[PDB]
Ligand binder design. Structure first.
Ligand SMILES: [Ca+2]
Ligand SMILES: [Ca+2]
Ligand SMILES: [Cl-]
Ligand SMILES: [Cl-]
Lengths: 73, 57, 73, 73
């Protein structure tokens, strides 16, 4: 459920903890929307493993792509 | 309901996280003005870019 | 073969005609490497169909993605 | 002929060596265009310094961005 997934987001922005990619997804969204991210989320963005952090951001880029080429029709 | 960019940002997030988006969010993704929808997605791509190059150091 | 593709490229390079995405690929290349494109290539980049031109550049972006996530291991 | 930025782009494929960025740019182009890259080009792709290789690929991504953004007007 997306309810399971909402709640996750909500704890994830309260504490910076929880799934690496979720916190990164949150960060991307906090940037997409002109919103200042929570200290707990920002704190994590400075700690995440460079290699893993890139893995995830890159697939976000990919996801955006499928959304873009979708709207090209 | 609410800001075009916000709903799209939500959509992006729902795809980044492997979460199935709510019908009300999906419903709007089919209605968005092609032109404006593009403008936004493209700026998302740009923001991801800033984050990537940041982690390259 | 690729020599077929090479001669194809070289042709597209002097006279900017030939396949839309090839000329756009060339253009990406001429930007990737800091080289100033031929008048014939540049002249086409102002004429390309907005929608088609977009389709292609987006696919390039995709291609680069597979290359980058490749280097992440 | 009167193309300084060809005669080395010549070398590159029939001769695996030369600037790291150039070789990766060629690789990008060989992927954008549905062309199978030369052994000598592919050989280098396996040897490039991961860190430098990513620096370059990410700047390509950026270049494609300016080109996309451009076509959106
Ligand atoms: Ca984890
Ligand atoms: Ca064509
Ligand atoms: Cl969590
Ligand atoms: Cl041809």
């Amino acid at each position: 459920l997306s309810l399971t997934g909402l709640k996750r987001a909500m704890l994830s922005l309260i504490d910076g903890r929880g799934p690496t990619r979720f916190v990164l997804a949150l960060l991307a969204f906090f940037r997409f929307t002109a919103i200042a991210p929570t200290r707990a989320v920002l704190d994590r963005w400075r700690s995440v493993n460079k290699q893993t952090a890139m893995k995830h951001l890159l697939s976000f880029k990919k996801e955006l792509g499928t959304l873009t080429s979708a709207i090209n029709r």
